[PDB]
Amino acid sequence: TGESKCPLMVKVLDAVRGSPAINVAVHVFRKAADDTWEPFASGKTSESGELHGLTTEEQFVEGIYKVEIDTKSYWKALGISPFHEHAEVVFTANDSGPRRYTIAALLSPYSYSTTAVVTNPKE
Amino acid sequence: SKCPLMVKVLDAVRGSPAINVAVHVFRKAADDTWEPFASGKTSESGELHGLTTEEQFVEGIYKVEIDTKSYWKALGISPFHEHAEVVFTANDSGPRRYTIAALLSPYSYSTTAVVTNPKE
Amino acid sequence: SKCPLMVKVLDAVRGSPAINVAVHVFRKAADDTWEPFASGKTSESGELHGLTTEEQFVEGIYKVEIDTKSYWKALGISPFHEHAEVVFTANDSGPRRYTIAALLSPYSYSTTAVVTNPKE
């Protein structure tokens, strides 16, 4: 796995069904040189509601990233018409070196919340 | 023209106001006895209103308790929350206008305070 | 209300409206190009109001993009989010009232929809 290292980490949750938002489709984008969200990394959440190991510390460079979470699919495939097309989190990452970004999300059809947890490595 | 206390509730699952929720404001008094203060059911627009007067709003350790369970039961979902509380010492520095809004879904809720000063 | 779309923004840290946030509605056009739809700054009461007309709000994937970071830089705290976005498809089933309400704090935010049908 990592030992504990995880630069970019996504956690997704179902506040309607008290449980892990299993199998969501996260598409982490890195905006590059000219306002072009160049595809960075992608995945599907685990049984534990966590995507993991989307990048290495040598790929995670100082830039505006974007975790885009496919919420509509989670809902369509549950039979409710969701409000939100998808849930995004656009954040300038590794400026001050503190590599560990945990983006956790909490869903329901017409509302979502996101929180970041920015923990320093060993400086 | 006022509303010292004021409650707004919202259904996150059905993207609509949480109509007819039983809100129950208490007022802890002298010896940690939560003495009943005021009650109401949320309107068509999702607002309980006029729950008190300024000269009835004294000082600190108030509580608004919203009967969420009754909302979810009466919709057919087994909620995770017995009911919602917003314990707040509201009156101290005199800024009377309190507006508690809430968002409710089966296994999560979140609420916020919008305390605005009257006219000092 | 006769408000096609409408935004509210609130400062969870200071328990007050988030005054003067630069809200930017966008309407994705024919070829994935987020062509500029409409723009405004939240009022005393945290509300942008009047950003389109019913003949101007067309069945499309709209975006409201809230300037969260300029809210927090001009308060002197280094926020997390570059800004907040609400991307939603609209007026496909005719129910033209949309209210987007957001809740700001440095490293977290939430946003809820309140989709209400006019008079069918």
Place this chain on the structure above:
Amino acid sequence: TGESKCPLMVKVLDAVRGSPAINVAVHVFRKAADDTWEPFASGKTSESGELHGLTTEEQFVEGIYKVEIDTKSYWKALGISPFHEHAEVVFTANDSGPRRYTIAALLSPYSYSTTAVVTNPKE
């Protein structure tokens, strides 16, 4: 334990500072027989902000519980005059046997959020 065998479980996050809300005194109550919230369990949230191992499967009995997070102390000792007296997740537990309760919370000055994740043991 190993990983997850931990019936009740609390996690708290600082939505103002971007990190684990370390050292919150989390009190767990358990209503008893006649509307008397007996004191059930207590603790402090760790370096990852987790309180962990508040009870045993043989002590977590069917009934109302309450976890009570002392928020104002957190906020007092950080210099912010908070709105909230404390937070409480009152919840009828163990009825159908599905032991694992995880109450994560999200703390700011004039709002807080919490979410319940109830996962079933192995039926």
Place this chain on the structure above:
Amino acid sequence: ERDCRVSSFRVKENFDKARFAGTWYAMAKKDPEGLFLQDNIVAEFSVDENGHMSATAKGRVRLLNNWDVCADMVGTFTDTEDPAKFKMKYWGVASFLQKGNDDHWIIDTDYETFAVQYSCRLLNLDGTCADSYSFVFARDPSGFSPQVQKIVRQRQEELCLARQYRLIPHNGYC
């Protein structure tokens, strides 16, 4: 062989719109893949002066965290080349209920007593429906006359979903 291509399929000769108009209690449905209406299903068809057919079904659907909502839909149809095949837009009175552009094939109907309803959602490459739903309507709550009941069993096999039909309890959930 049996000719199960969603092109091979004979549907209603000369469908009078303003005959089909009216309440029809679903009797059997062939489930698609997905959330579908579980039971208690009733349509009500109408065709306004500019000959447009709109319909409204009610019906019990168990939305996943297991709440049995009694879904009110609305369907607004657009006509095709054929008089018995249309394209139907649907949605709920509630924002949260499904929305779509579905198929709505009348296979047959004697407008006074029954109807088979067809909709293929995904075709296959070869032409067989990868996903269909078919409603047998009766125009009387009770069930319906064995003669015409014979007609609709027959059709079902000519449509190839046959052996896949399920009964609908109408037991006043709405």
Place this chain on the structure above:
Amino acid sequence: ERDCRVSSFRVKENFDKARFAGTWYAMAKKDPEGLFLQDNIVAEFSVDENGHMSATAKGRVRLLNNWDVCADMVGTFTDTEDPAKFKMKYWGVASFLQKGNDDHWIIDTDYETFAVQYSCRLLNLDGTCADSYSFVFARDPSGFSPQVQKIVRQRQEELCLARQYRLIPHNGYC
């Protein structure tokens, strides 16, 4: 007149980075527009083997909702063609504190006792600095000798900030 164009400001000749190294206590600061360290500022400058200079600094800032916050920042300096003028990237040990690039000119400093600092953030069209902070750093926290005090008051007027400086208490709020 005076010439208050940031372009005509004489800074330290032949700055020895490994002779500015060390703790400097802030004594008077000129505020920029914006949120700055309110008082208790102490900077600690160290130059590492590969010639670079790095600074860390503690100080009280009353973060708006009014907490009041001792903020340790970190700075890493990039050199320019002048040995007494650099760019600073700053940030906080806590991710919610202010990051930036500030210029960081050492106007004068006899490394055993003082140093004026200056940094212009926004420059006006005619060249005068539109937004600017400045620190008077003493090496002993009591203040500093009258002689070096008289050099510094001088310098302060050359920069055009004389009459805008205010004192910093050191009271131990960290």
